[PDB]
Design a protein around this nucleic acid. Structure first.
Ligand SMILES: [Zn+2]
Lengths: 82, 145, 121, 362, 108, 147, 247, 114
RNA sequence: GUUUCCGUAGUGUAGUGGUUAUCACGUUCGCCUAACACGCGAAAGGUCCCCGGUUCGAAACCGGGCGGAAAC
RNA sequence: GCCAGCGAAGUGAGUUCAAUGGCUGAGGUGAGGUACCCCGCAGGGGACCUCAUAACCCAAUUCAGACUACUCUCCUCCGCCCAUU
């Protein structure tokens, strides 16, 4: 018998998104992604520097999955403004 | 019994800091006649291993000290007699009135007797000096200074 | 009394060192308290039976060996029966009862004056 | 693990720089004037059988240097010694034959910074503010204290000066054998023999060895190529290995026998008939090398038969601080050295040798 | 990936030395409320999509990611390639700097 | 509180099979420890002697298993090509051949010996083509299914 | 950083003993110590007047370093094999307090454990001559590194036979995989006037042993300082050293 | 040559030395021969204890099965089983394409509309 | 992985349900003998593995750190 | 106080005569330097070069928790002494 992590591999190997908060909707996905952002930010401040790789040098805002309030507004600003 | 003995503190105040340090010399004079009354033989050839062993449990309150080695360069060279003696610190008073606190962390103190000079490595000598005279001074380690 | 003979010198030295502080400068008694607190601790761990004539001046509340003799209040009064000499300091406010009477001078010579005639070499 | 460290490497570094003497931003003067200790000064000129008389008088006038036996440290911090030599010039001090990882070593800077390297038995007894220099695992054994004497000269009655002056006189006596020298840069000229009349001071002259080598096989160089073109020019790395063998009397050919010497000349080369050798052995001031560097820069004022000349200065194996910040240690060898390969078109190669535990400035 | 300049480092020693000054907005190593110009053009390769379920698969036998993109990110790439293979689109993990290519295929 | 070992296999491939009958643990320990002192010096002769011991040897088969450390496996495994002239009462010239250097782990070191043994008898079928020997192969297959 | 210490095992005459002092003063050695071999068969302990350093030396040692006189000290190395002989060594704590640094040479694993835990010695001699195998256990090593005990890993294989080169490199590499190299010193017991090398060359024989890439230089300087200082706290007392100063 | 380590790795309990009753019957007879060679009580109504604890979370009927051998992490709803204490990450997929598996999904609510 | 026990002059070991350090062997000396092996008396010799804590006082009691030993 | 187990394939390391923390190169962070570039507020950023990255320690069925041995490091709370205003 598995658990919630075994309930998480039930959908990601079946190529369907998970039902709690992994699909972005307005009332539900914004509350779980913020709850997802509260767990890894606590883990980010837990580790001292010179042990973790920096994120300004390598990429962008990550692993915090909320730029799509402005990312979907940006890809329409690239096409419709020309 | 714990907090009731610790109401203000047993610590000094501002006014006994200026008590004209040459008047603390009879406290050193009392200690100077105390060492002569302890072994009662000094001059011809009398057991230098005994002198350094009786000072293990001896109450060295009111004795002159001078720091000849310490890990801090600022601690080295401070002279004066001591008044308090706590777990790993002991408070001394120096020349013209000012008191200084030197910790017993990693340093040695030089105690001048009449015809003897004994170094006291302050890294092993700690832990509430009333209990130093009681028990448990065993052979452990070196003092890399 | 072979190894314990060294221990008698370490107790009366710190007792006398508290008198040398108060003989030169009174009203600053932090040195007299710590020298009595170290004196009581050595006698607590290295067990010695001190005399009741000196020990009744140490003021066993925390520590004051000379302070009630020249600063605090030691007077005579009659509480219920025989009169009592009450020794009370001004730090921990504890009292020690000692009765002074001519009817019990035979018992007053029992703890202290009997060892003056029986302790032989 | 046990087989890796038997064959891996020691730490060594080389920085090669090409530049121009006529450049306004060139640091050929600043790197020599701020290099503090010099023992071996050797220069080579190919095809030179008759030396110029101006350069010959410059070799014989590099010193002198003085040696004082059993000089204490409190003598060098008196206000009489500072106002005589330090305030009116640049005085140098180096404790002779006291190795940097064995005993105490005291050095003096021309900026007035008495930077001394002490061990653990002395750093705890003097009581001077310092910092660790090289980590030997966990037990730190060496410490270096920097004492700026010029900032103490403004306030001689300050608490910083009386802490240091008491630490040497009555607190810790420390006598040494100093290699003393002074550059005359003052109005009132007073010799060092008049000041140190009590101790055993001896005036020493630098050893001058003049030689002439014949039939030397010099490589082919291009100043605008450091890595070396194939079969046309040579690499600047290959000349730094070749140059030490000429000074060490090693110029041989291929000998297939029981004693094969596998030391080939860097190719392509050119047979050069004459080669002038010199060796200036002594405590050399860096200001005398600056008059030597500018004379070799003015050596190509006339059309000479030599394509390039040599200026190589080797420092001590006992210098605490060189290049203004670099704490030179001693881990099974390692010495500091710089080099000048001066060409006819005012171009030079700067080959700086870095020891075992040492850094390098530009 | 070519590394990017970090001008936010000068405000960190400004923040640490001010915090110890006032004793005697927590933006330390990757947080800032300025997300407007980066979504336009920040990285070398233009980023368009994320991955929510990122793990290696025991079914196929290799890395199988699962995430979300936009339509205008797809149809800008799909208009550029009417020729051969089209779903060959690189991905970049934030802990690394190595672009790795996958095969986009929408199975509905 | 334990040491990490390395176990290397060897195989004597030679003609004149009287050399394969003259194999012993006293001779093999005096052969390998001597030829390290002939190729290398006294450093590797004793650095590969404090953990070196023999554990597995079949004179009829010809498989040699040796012991060595994590820090000194590169000296034994490099001394293997330079082992010639096994001197005895006769004239013998063997030469060792490695199969797979196993990092410790005796169990899978014996597993590789099984898959090496199974591939040797299958090739031996058509090349030999003997009626009396093919019945002996059928005795090897049947007893292996009984294991 | 007191550099280039030694442990010499040679006494038969003053002509060969003074020659080892002048030879060690030539290369790099500032402090030279002399051992005294005491066996369990003879049961003889000449402690009273063994050397007379100030009497039998000509008053002026000269090194090429700081030109300081050599701190010539007298050490003791006892060949111990039976537990009925170590009881005499345990009786030397109050009878005869001489021989400033005392080294012990164990032969039994029951006797090696008490020397590193119970017996108060300064250093432990580990030499292997003529087929002497000995297991190195980790609990008697892990206590000795915190106590301050060091190990005289004395090398002298080039005297008589080249087969002794194997038994020095074998026992040392058994120690380096176990002790991890915290306090292990190396020195040469020299009886001939040319059996001593320069201390810049000794530091690779400890790197032949491995032991570090850098602390092999500190195995003759730093670890020899902590091993000589362990004999000073054993000589007078462990916490208070009282010295008589008469100017 | 050990009997206690002959058992399969899924069937290993470290309390085999304190009480022998955590072992099978046939393996106990050898362990009785090996025994010759080799905190307070609780008296409270546990039903009323779990009734008080149910005021905070939801506390399903099978919580006494799951919390005993799973890592319990509180979430947006109640605490439910997420990861097993025994390492079974490769075992859950292996018991899903070849063998059998079942879960406890009781947080899925239902809305009846008459 | 598992369990229990142990650390005491030089060795083997008692002892203590907390305030004193000892018995056997061996050494030294003494008794004895022309000089002896036994018997017998007495002395030298203590980090009671280490630290903390409880208590008026831990060889002991408790806690931690090692160490050692008995067997599947 | 006392009473309850299952020999059956395969642990996001799964060894059991007991595998595995690898090398080189490029970074991160923490010191040091610039004859280099850009932005023009003396300033800042980028580029390049040198160096530190450890100690304590080892999986044997697994997990949670307490205790103990720790420093290349980061955060909080302070002490002592030196020097300055
Ligand atoms: Zn009071």
């Amino acid at each position: 018998v598995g658990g919630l992590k075994e309930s998480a591999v039930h959908s990601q190997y079946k190529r369907s998104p998970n039902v709690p908060g992994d699909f972005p909707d307005c009332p539900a996905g914004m509350l779980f992604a913020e709850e997802q952002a509260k767990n890894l930010l606590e883990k980010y401040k837990r580790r001292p520097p010179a042990k973790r790789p920096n994120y300004v040098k390598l990429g962008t805002l990550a692993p915090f999955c909320c730029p799509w309030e402005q990312l979907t507004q940006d890809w329409e600003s690239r096409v419709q403004a020309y | 019994l714990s907090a009731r003995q610790r109401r203000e503190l047993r610590l000094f105040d501002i006014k006994p800091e200026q008590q004209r340090y040459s008047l603390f010399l009879p406290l050193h004079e009392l200690w100077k006649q105390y060492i002569r009354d302890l072994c009662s033989g000094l001059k011809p050839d009398t057991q230098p291993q005994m002198i350094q062993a009786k000072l293990l449990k001896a109450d060295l309150h009111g004795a002159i000290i001078s720091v000849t080695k310490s890990k801090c360069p600022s601690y080295v060279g401070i002279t004066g007699i001591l008044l308090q003696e706590t777990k790993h610190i002991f408070k001394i008073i120096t020349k013209e009135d000012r008191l200084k606190v030197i910790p017993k962390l990693n340093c040695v103190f030089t105690v001048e007797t009449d015809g003897f000079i004994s170094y006291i490595y302050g890294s092993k000598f700690q832990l509430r000096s009333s209990e130093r005279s009681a028990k448990k001074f065993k052979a452990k380690g070196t003092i890399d200074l | 009394p072979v190894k314990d003979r060294e221990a008698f010198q370490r107790l009366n030295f710190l007792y006398q060192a508290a008198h040398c502080v108060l003989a030169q400068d009174p009203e600053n008694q932090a040195l007299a308290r710590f020298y009595c607190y170290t004196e009581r601790t050595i006698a607590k761990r290295l067990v010695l039976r001190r005399d009741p004539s000196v020990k009744r001046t140490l003021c066993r509340g925390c520590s004051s060996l000379l302070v009630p003799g020249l600063t605090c209040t030691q007077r005579q009064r009659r509480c219920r029966g025989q009169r009592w000499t009450v020794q009370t300091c001004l730090t921990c406010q504890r009292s020690q009862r000692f009765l002074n009477d001519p009817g019990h001078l035979l018992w007053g010579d029992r703890p202290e004056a009997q060892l003056g005639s029986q302790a032989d070499s | 693990a046990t087989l890796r460290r038997l064959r891996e490497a020691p730490r060594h570094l080389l920085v090669c720089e090409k530049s121009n003497f006529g450049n306004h931003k060139s640091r050929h003067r600043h790197l020599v004037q701020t290099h503090y200790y010099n023992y071996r000064v050797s220069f080579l000129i190919p095809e030179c059988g008759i030396l110029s008389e101006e350069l010959k008088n410059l070799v014989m006038n590099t010193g002198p240097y003085y040696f004082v036996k059993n000089l204490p440290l409190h003598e060098l911090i008196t206000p009489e010694f500072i106002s005589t030599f330090i305030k009116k010039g640049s005085c140098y001090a180096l404790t002779y034959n006291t190795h940097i990882d064995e005993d105490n070593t005291v050095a003096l800077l021309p900026n007035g910074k008495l930077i001394l390297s002490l061990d653990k038995d002395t750093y705890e007894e003097t009581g001077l503010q310092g910092h660790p220099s090289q980590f030997s695992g966990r037990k730190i054994m060496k410490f270096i204290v920097s004492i700026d004497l010029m900032e103490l000269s403004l306030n001689l009655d300050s608490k910083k000066y009386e802490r240091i002056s008491w630490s040497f006189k009555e607190k810790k006596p420390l006598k040494f054998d100093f290699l003393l020298a002074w550059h005359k840069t003052g109005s009132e000229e007073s010799t060092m023999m008049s000041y140190f009349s009590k101790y055993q001071i001896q005036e020493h002259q630098p050893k001058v060895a003049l030689s002439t080598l014949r039939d030397l096989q010099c490589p082919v160089l291009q100043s605008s190529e450091l890595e070396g073109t194939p079969e046309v020019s040579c690499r600047a790395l290959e000349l730094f290995d070749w140059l030490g063998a000429v000074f060490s009397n090693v110029d041989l050919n291929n000998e297939p026998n029981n004693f094969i010497s596998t030391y080939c000349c860097p190719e392509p080369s050119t047979v050069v008939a004459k080669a002038y050798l010199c060796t200036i052995t002594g405590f050399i001031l860096p200001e005398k090398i600056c008059l030597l560097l500018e004379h070799l820069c003015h050596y190509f004022d006339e059309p000479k038969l030599a394509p390039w000349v040599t200026l190589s200065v080797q420092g001590f194996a006992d210098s605490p601080v060189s290049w203004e910040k670099n704490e030179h240690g001693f881990r099974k060898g390692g010495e500091h050295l710089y080099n000048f390969v001066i060409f006819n078109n005012q171009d030079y190669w700067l080959q700086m040798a870095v020891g075992a535990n040492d850094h390098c400035p530009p | 990936e070519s590394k990017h300049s970090d001008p936010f480092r000068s405000k960190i020693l400004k923040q640490k030395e001010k915090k110890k000054r006032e004793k005697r907005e927590a933006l330390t190593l990757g947080l800032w409320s300025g997300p407007l110009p980066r979504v336009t053009l920040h990285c070398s390769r233009t980023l368009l999509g994320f991955v929510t379920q990122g793990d290696f698969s025991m079914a196929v036998g290799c890395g199988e990611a699962l995430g979300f993109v936009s339509l205008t990110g797809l149809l800008d790439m799909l208009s550029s390639q009417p020729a051969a293979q089209r779903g060959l689109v690189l991905l970049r993990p934030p802990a690394s700097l190595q672009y790795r290519f996958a095969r986009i295929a929408i199975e509905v | 509180v334990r040491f990490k070992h390395r176990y290397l296999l060897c195989e004597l491939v030679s003609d004149d099979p009287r050399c394969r009958l003259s194999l012993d643990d006293r001779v093999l320990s005096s052969l390998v420890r001597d030829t390290i002192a002939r190729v290398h010096g006294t450093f590797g002769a004793a650095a590969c002697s404090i953990g070196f011991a023999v554990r597995y040897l079949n004179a009829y088969t010809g498989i040699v298993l040796l012991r060595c450390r994590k820090e000194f496996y590169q000296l034994v495994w490099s001394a293997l090509p330079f082992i010639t002239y096994l001197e005895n009462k006769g004239h013998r010239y063997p030469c060792f051949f490695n199969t797979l250097h196993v990092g410790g782990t005796i169990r899978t070191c014996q597993k590789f010996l099984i898959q090496y043994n199974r591939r040797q008898l299958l090739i031996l079928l058509q090349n030999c083509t003997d009626e009396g020997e093919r019945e002996a192969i059928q005795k090897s297959v049947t007893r292996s299914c009984l294991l | 950083a007191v550099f280039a210490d030694l442990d010499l095992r040679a006494g038969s005459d003053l002509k060969a003993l003074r020659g080892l002092v002048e030879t060690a003063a030539h290369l790099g050695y500032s402090v030279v110590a002399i051992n005294h071999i005491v066996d369990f068969k003879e049961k003889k302990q000449e402690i009273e007047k063994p050397v007379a350093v100030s009497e039998l030396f000509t008053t002026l040692p000269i090194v090429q370093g700081k030109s300081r006189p050599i701190k010539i000290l007298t050490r003791l190395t006892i060949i111990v094999s039976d537990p009925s002989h170590c009881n005499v060594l345990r009786a030397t704590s109050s009878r005869a307090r001489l021989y400033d640094v005392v080294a012990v040479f164990p032969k039994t694993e029951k006797l090696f454990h008490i020397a590193c835990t119970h017996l108060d010695v300064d250093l432990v001699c580990i030499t292997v001559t003529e087929k002497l195998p000995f297991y190195f256990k980790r609990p008697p090593i892990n206590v000795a590194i915190d106590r301050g005990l060091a190990f005289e890993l004395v090398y002298s294989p080039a005297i008589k036979d080249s087969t002794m080169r194997r038994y020095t490199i074998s026992s040392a590499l058994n120690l380096m995989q176990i002790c991890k190299g915290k306090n292990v010193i190396i020195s040469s017991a020299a009886e001939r006037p040319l059996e001593i090398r320069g201390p810049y060359d000794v530091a690779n024989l400890g790197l032949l042993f491995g032991l570090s890439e850098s602390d092999a230089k500190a195995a003759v300087s730093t670890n020899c300082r902590a091993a000589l200082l362990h004999g000073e706290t054993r000589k007078t007392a462990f916490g208070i050293i009282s010295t008589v100063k008469k100017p | 040559s050990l009997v206690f380590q002959t058992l399969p790795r899924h069937m290993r309990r470290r309390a085999m030395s304190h009480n022998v009753k955590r072992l099978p019957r046939r393996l106990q007879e050898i362990a009785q021969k090996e025994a010759e060679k080799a905190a307070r009580r609780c008296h409270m109504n546990r039903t009323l204890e779990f009734n008080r604890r149910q005021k905070k979370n939801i506390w399903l009927e099978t919580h006494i099965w799951h919390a005993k051998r799973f890592h319990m992490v509180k979430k947006w709803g109640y605490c439910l089983g997420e990861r097993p204490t025994v390492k079974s990450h490769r075992a859950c997929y292996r018991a899903m394409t070849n063998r059998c598996l079942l879960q406890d999904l009781s947080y899925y609510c239902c809305l009846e509309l008459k």
